[PDB]
Design an enzyme around this catalytic site. Structure first.
Site, PDB file in Angstrom:
ATOM      1  N   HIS B  61      -6.236   8.149   8.766  1.00 25.38           N
ATOM      2  CA  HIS B  61      -4.994   8.770   9.188  1.00 25.38           C
ATOM      3  C   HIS B  61      -5.002  10.254   8.859  1.00 25.38           C
ATOM      4  CE1 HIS B  61      -2.697   4.726   8.908  1.00 25.38           C
ATOM      5  NE2 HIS B  61      -3.302   4.882  10.074  1.00 25.38           N
ATOM      6  N   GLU B  63      -2.871  12.040   7.180  1.00 28.13           N
ATOM      7  CA  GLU B  63      -2.584  12.304   5.778  1.00 28.13           C
ATOM      8  C   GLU B  63      -3.801  12.039   4.891  1.00 28.13           C
ATOM      9  OE1 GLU B  63      -1.304  10.126   8.009  1.00 28.13           O
ATOM     10  OE2 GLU B  63       0.676   9.429   7.369  1.00 28.13           O
ATOM     11  N   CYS B  97       2.603   6.184   6.912  1.00 25.64           N
ATOM     12  CA  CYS B  97       2.522   4.722   6.919  1.00 25.64           C
ATOM     13  C   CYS B  97       2.659   4.170   5.494  1.00 25.64           C
ATOM     14  CB  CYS B  97       1.213   4.231   7.555  1.00 25.64           C
ATOM     15  SG  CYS B  97      -0.341   4.672   6.644  1.00 25.64           S
ATOM     16  N   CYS B 100      -0.560   5.486   3.511  1.00 27.78           N
ATOM     17  CA  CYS B 100      -0.554   6.890   3.101  1.00 27.78           C
ATOM     18  C   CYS B 100       0.561   7.187   2.103  1.00 27.78           C
ATOM     19  CB  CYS B 100      -0.431   7.777   4.338  1.00 27.78           C
ATOM     20  SG  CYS B 100      -1.491   7.198   5.687  1.00 27.78           S
TER      21      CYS B 100
END
Ligand SMILES: [Zn+2]
Ligand SMILES: [Zn+2]
EC number: 3.5.4.33
Lengths: 283, 166
Positions: B61, B63, B97, B100
């Site tokens: 992701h 992040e 999410c 993260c």
């Protein structure tokens, strides 16, 4: 001599579900001792050890009869004769009548609030076994492999947490790894390391859901970061030894058993647990 | 109050307009359109967009990319990660999410500015609230400033899923 206990959804864990079983009445109550031996040997019902196999009845009037729990019901639960269900000469069936269907509770009750609820459909005891005994050795040598890896980590001065990733189709070990968290690199928990191993070992054309179908054995329960990673990666099954205090596959969350995530997968706990209790927890 | 947080927060318009530019970068790169910046003292320390299909790895992701860029920026300049992360403001298009959110907790990030909600997987309230959760062994809870330019950021997701299968 360890057991593997499923970790089920928040909702599904506190309910009593039933399955169809064939019972038959005992007319000649003196064949009871005998017919119990002869029958629970053919159909031992290993999946269901919580079920007392004779159900006593009382008549308004005091007439004491019983019914014998015979066997589980096939996917097409029609009436079945005595001859169809009880093979001879394994079972001298004399003393039994025509068999009927009966809902019997599918799993051993864990709380006393389910116990009184299960008992009402078929008797049951208070205070199962899930796998073959060759698969029980499959998971044996894999958890061992993850403990062997966990210990390697503690010896060097790292979080004593180990993990292996097994493809259940071939029982081939796909990645072995332990925690590698450092001051310069704090997010290398055992589970995160194992994923990045898996992903780099795959061909040009590969889905980015890099864990589909695979099993995972971890010494103790994944943290939130690890657990969600297995969701994004679509792991198939996860076996862990002991829980973790902030664990996301049992203890403080069950992210494997949610409707809201795009993915759901089985979690079992207790594999080689006595060993893993003294390993470190995630995170 | 944190000194490097208040200074970083000031040019928030500037850091989002780049965070958005990174989501348009990821969109036209057939990625989930999330882009983020990590600002330590009014200086970009890590950037990052979603790299999931690109790496054929789903943990990548936006992040999680940035967190790695900032651990690099810590290593080149020989600063300990604790004293940088704890004063870093993260600017991301979309509520982090559930995963993260946990990483940022472990990195002891203190503050997050996000655009639109995260209905599918959000760990800042939408699905679970990992950010404020009481997780004694999973880092430090952090607070959130939601909503910044959300309408623009959501019209990026809407036009990614009606486009993935019509
Ligand atoms: Zn973890
Ligand atoms: Zn994320």
């Amino acid at each position: 001599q360890w057991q593997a206990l499923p970790v089920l959804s928040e909702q599904q864990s506190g309910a009593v579900e039933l399955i169809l079983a064939y019972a038959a009445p005992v007319l000649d109550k003196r064949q009871t001792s005998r017919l119990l031996r002869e029958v629970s040997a053919v159909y031992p019902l290993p999946a269901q050890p919580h079920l007392k196999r004779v159900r006593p009845s009382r008549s308004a009037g005091g007439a004491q009869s019983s019914d014998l729990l015979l066997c589980l019901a096939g996917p097409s639960a029609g009436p079945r004769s005595l001859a169809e269900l009880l093979p001879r000469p394994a079972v001298d069936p004399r003393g039994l009548g025509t068999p009927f269907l009966v809902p019997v509770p599918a799993r051993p009750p864990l709380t006393r609030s389910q116990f009184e609820e299960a008992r009402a459909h078929w008797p049951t005891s208070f205070h199962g076994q899930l796998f073959s005994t060759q698969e029980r050795a499959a998971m044996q040598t894999h958890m061992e492999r993850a403990v062997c890896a966990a210990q390697r980590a503690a010896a060097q001065g790292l979080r004593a947490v180990g993990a292996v990733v097994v493809d259940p189709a071939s029982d081939r070990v796909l990645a072995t790894g332990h925690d590698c968290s450092s001051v310069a690199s704090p997010l290398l928990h055992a589970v995160m390391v194992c994923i990045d191993l898996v992903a780099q070992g795959q061909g040009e054309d590969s889905l980015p859901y890099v864990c589909t179908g695979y099993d995972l054995y971890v010494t103790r329960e994944p943290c939130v970061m690890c657990a969600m990673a297995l969701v994004h990666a679509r792991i198939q099954r996860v076996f862990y030894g002991a829980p973790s205090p902030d664990g996301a596959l049992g203890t403080l969350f069950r992210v494997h058993a949610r409707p809201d995530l795009n993915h759901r997968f089985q979690v079992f706990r207790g594999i080689l647990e006595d060993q893993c209790r003294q390993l470190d927890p995630d995170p | 109050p944190d000194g490097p947080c208040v200074v970083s927060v000031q040019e928030t318009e500037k850091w989002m307009e780049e965070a958005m530019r990174m989501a348009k970068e990821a969109l036209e790169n057939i990625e989930v359109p999330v882009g983020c910046l990590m600002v330590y003292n009014n200086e970009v320390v890590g950037k990052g967009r979603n790299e999931v299909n690109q790496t054929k790895n789903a943990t990548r992701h936006a992040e999680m990319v940035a967190i790695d860029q900032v651990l690099d920026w810590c290593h080149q300049h020989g600063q300990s990660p604790s004293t940088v992360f704890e004063h870093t403001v993260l600017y991301v298009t979309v509520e982090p999410c559930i995963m993260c959110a946990a990483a940022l907790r472990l990195m002891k990030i203190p503050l997050v500015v996000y655009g639109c909600q995260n209905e599918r997987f959000g760990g800042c309230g939408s699905v679970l609230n990992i950010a404020s959760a009481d997780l004694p062994n999973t880092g430090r809870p952090f607070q959130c400033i939601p909503g910044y330019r959300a309408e623009e950021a959501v019209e990026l997701l809407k036009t990614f899923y009606k486009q993935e299968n019509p």
